[PDB]
Amino acid sequence: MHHHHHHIEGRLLDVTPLSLGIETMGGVMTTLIAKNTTIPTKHSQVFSTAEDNQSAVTIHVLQGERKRAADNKSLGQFNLDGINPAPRGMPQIEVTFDIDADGILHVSAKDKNSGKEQKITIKASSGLNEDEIQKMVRDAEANAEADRKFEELVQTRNQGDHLLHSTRKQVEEAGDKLPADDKTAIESALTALETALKGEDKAAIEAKMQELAQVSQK
Amino acid sequence: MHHHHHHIEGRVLLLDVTPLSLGIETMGGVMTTLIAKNTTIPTKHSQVFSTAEDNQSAVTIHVLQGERKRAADNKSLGQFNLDGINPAPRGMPQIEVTFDIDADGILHVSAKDKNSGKEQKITIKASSGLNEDEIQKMVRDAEANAEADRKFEELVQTRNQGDHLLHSTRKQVEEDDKTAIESALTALETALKGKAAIEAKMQELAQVS
Ligand SMILES: C(#C[P+](c1ccccc1)(c1ccccc1)c1ccccc1)c1ccccc1
Numbered sequence: 220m221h222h223h224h225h226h227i228e229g230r231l232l233d234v235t236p237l238s239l240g241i242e243t244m245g246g247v248m249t250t251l252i253a254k255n256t257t258i259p260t261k262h263s264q265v266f267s268t269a270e271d272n273q274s275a276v277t278i279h280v281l282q283g284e285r286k287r288a289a290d291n292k293s294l295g296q297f298n299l300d301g302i303n304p305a306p307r308g309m310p311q312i313e314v315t316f317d318i319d320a321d322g323i324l325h326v327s328a329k330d331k332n333s334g335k336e337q338k339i340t341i342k343a344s345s346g347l348n349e350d351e352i353q354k355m356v357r358d359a360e361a362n363a364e365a366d367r368k369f370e371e372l373v374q375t376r377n378q379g380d381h382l383l384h385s386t387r388k389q390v391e392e393a394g395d396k397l398p399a400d401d402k403t404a405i406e407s408a409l410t411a412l413e414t415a416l417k418g419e420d421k422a423a424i425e426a427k428m429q430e431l432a433q434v435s436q437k
Numbered sequence: 438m439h440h441h442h443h444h445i446e447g448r449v450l451l452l453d454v455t456p457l458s459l460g461i462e463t464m465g466g467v468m469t470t471l472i473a474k475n476t477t478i479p480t481k482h483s484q485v486f487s488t489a490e491d492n493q494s495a496v497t498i499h500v501l502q503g504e505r506k507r508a509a510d511n512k513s514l515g516q517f518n519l520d521g522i523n524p525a526p527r528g529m530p531q532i533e534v535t536f537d538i539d540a541d542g543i544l545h546v547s548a549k550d551k552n553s554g555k556e557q558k559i560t561i562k563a564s565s566g567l568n569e570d571e572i573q574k575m576v577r578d579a580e581a582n583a584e585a586d587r588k589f590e591e592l593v594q595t596r597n598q599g600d601h602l603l604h605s606t607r608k609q610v611e612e613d614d615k616t617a618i619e620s621a622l623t624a625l626e627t628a629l630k631g632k633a634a635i636e637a638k639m640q641e642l643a644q645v646s
Contacts (some may be wrong), residue, residue, distance in 0.1 A: 275565070297515035300565040340560035345521055 229257045232320055236352045238284035239294075239316060239324070244269045245373030248281050248288040251316045258318045266314055270384070271307045275300035278314065278328055280339075283352075285359045286366040286373075299328045299337045307381065376416050379428045383412050386435060404434040447477045454478065456564070456572055459514075459536060459544070462499040464489065465593030466508030471536040474504060474576075483535045487528045490604070495520035498534060498548050502564070504579035506586035506593075512575065514565065519548045519557045527601065538563075592632065599629060599639045606642060618645050 234257050240250035243266065251262050268276065276299045283291040302310065311331035318324055327338040359366070390405055408431035415427040458474035463486070471482045488496065495518050503511030522530060535547035542563030549556040579586075603626060612619070625638040 293518055295515065295517040295559055297561055298513060298565050300512070301567045301571070335566050337561065337565055339515060341517070342558040342560070344556045344558065345519075 232258055237282045237355065240281055241314065242279040242281060242288035245377050246288055247286055247370055247373040248291055250284055251314065254284055258322060259320055261315065261317045263313065263315045265311060267308055267312055268305065268310055269307060272304040274302055274304065276302065276312060278326060280326055283355045285362065286370045294324065295339050295341050297337055297339050301335050302330060302333055372419060372421055375421055376424060379412065379416055379424050382428060383409055386431060398437055408434050449477055457502040458504055459502050461534060462501055462508050464597045467506055467590060467593045468501055468503065468508065468511055471534065479539045481535065481537045483533060486532045486534055487530055489527060491526050492524035494522065496532065498546065500546055503575055505582065506590045515561050517557065517559050519555065521555055522550050522553045595635055596629065599635055602639055602642065621645055
């Protein structure tokens with residue numbers, strides 16, 4: 220009398236062996252469920268569109284926590300289409316990761332307007348063994364440098380690609396008044412920006428961003 | 438007859454049919470229809486597929502919807518992977534793919550390996566979805582393309598068979614005198630990248646076998 224309490228720990232219904240999440244722009248993994256999360260676990264988070272007016276969206280499920288989603292694993296994949304046109308970014312899609320007591324995974328994507336949604340339910344039945352996942356963890360903690368660095372690069376290449384397409388917009392879609400010689404300028408600007416962002420170097424791509432930035436004046 | 442013949446009809450409550458033929462991508466990026474368009478539901482269809490190479494490890498079940506024969510000419514739906522299957526030559530393992538649909542729109546994709554015992558199953562639903570205008574458009578354009586896609590199917594069928602032949606050849610050689618067979622190979626594959634001249638190529642590699 221009263222309020223006699225103490226602290227808590229994990230429930231034991233087994234923890235996740237490896238982190239789960241989806242793939243975002245730049246081919247990078249964003250973890251929606253951290254490694255060793257005691258289940259049943261439901262995480263809700265809201266992503267959105269990369270490009271203008273795109274009518275669909277893909278959700279690619281991952282495991283094996285590491286950046287560069289192609290270096291992780293693929294649990295499943297699916298689409299959500301029929302969505303209404305909006306400029307790049309900011310429609311509202313809602314991604315939900317659910318795991319019940321049976322460890323069977325449920326991924327869902329919803330739309331604020333629309334309301335056309337999809338979902339997947341993954342029954343496993345095979346999975347993996349401690350050895351393999353330990354190899355994945357080891358390889359992950361060895362590659363942490365190039366991983367985080369790659370994340371940085373993805374952020375950058377995203378900014379530069381977005382700025383570039385926005386420059387193509389603000390050039391062609393913008394008035395055709397066409398100040399003299401603008402052609403060559405923004406042409407090799409945005410083009411060198413292209414063949415820069417195609418390959419991967421941070422310094423080169425941002426430099427090219429500046430090169431296209433100075434000529435974007437008028 | 439003689440008791441009651443009085444034959445049957447498709448069972449439908451109201452709206453329940455598959456509007457689009459549901460299928461799975463196979464080689465050469467060609468759609469293999471597991472459940473045809475305009476099929477009453479519930480409906481379940483099972484088939485057996487297999488690997489394109491020895492010890493292929495995992496495999497990608499790719500679920501699509503549309504009437505087009507080509508991969509990209511359709512609208513994808515979902516996909517997943519079945520891994521951890523034993524070493525074995527092409528076509529040797531039996532991989533069972535199952536498309537289920539119940540009274541709802543919800544579909545169950547099963548994939549199993551009879552020999553390995555390994556199984557993986559996923560569950561998604563029906564359409565993504567997409568508006569009826571779209572679907573009607575894809576259908577109209579499908580009827581449009583038609584025989585072109587048919588020739589595409591015959592094509593990928595050949596190219597797949599011939600590729601199987603080339604793999605079987607190089608594998609049978611273990612590189613004699615096969616020099617003639619090797620440059621005839623290189624030529625035949627050079628043609629194999631880009632119609633009936635491919636069948637001719639198969640004939641040519643068969644002759645110098
Ligand atoms: C479908 C459907 P749908 C439907 C509703 C209720 C019961 C069975 C099927 C549907 C409707 C709304 C959202 C999602 C699916 C349907 C309804 C009317 C016409 C065509 C299809 C479908 C089924 C198989 C493959 C692709 C699509």
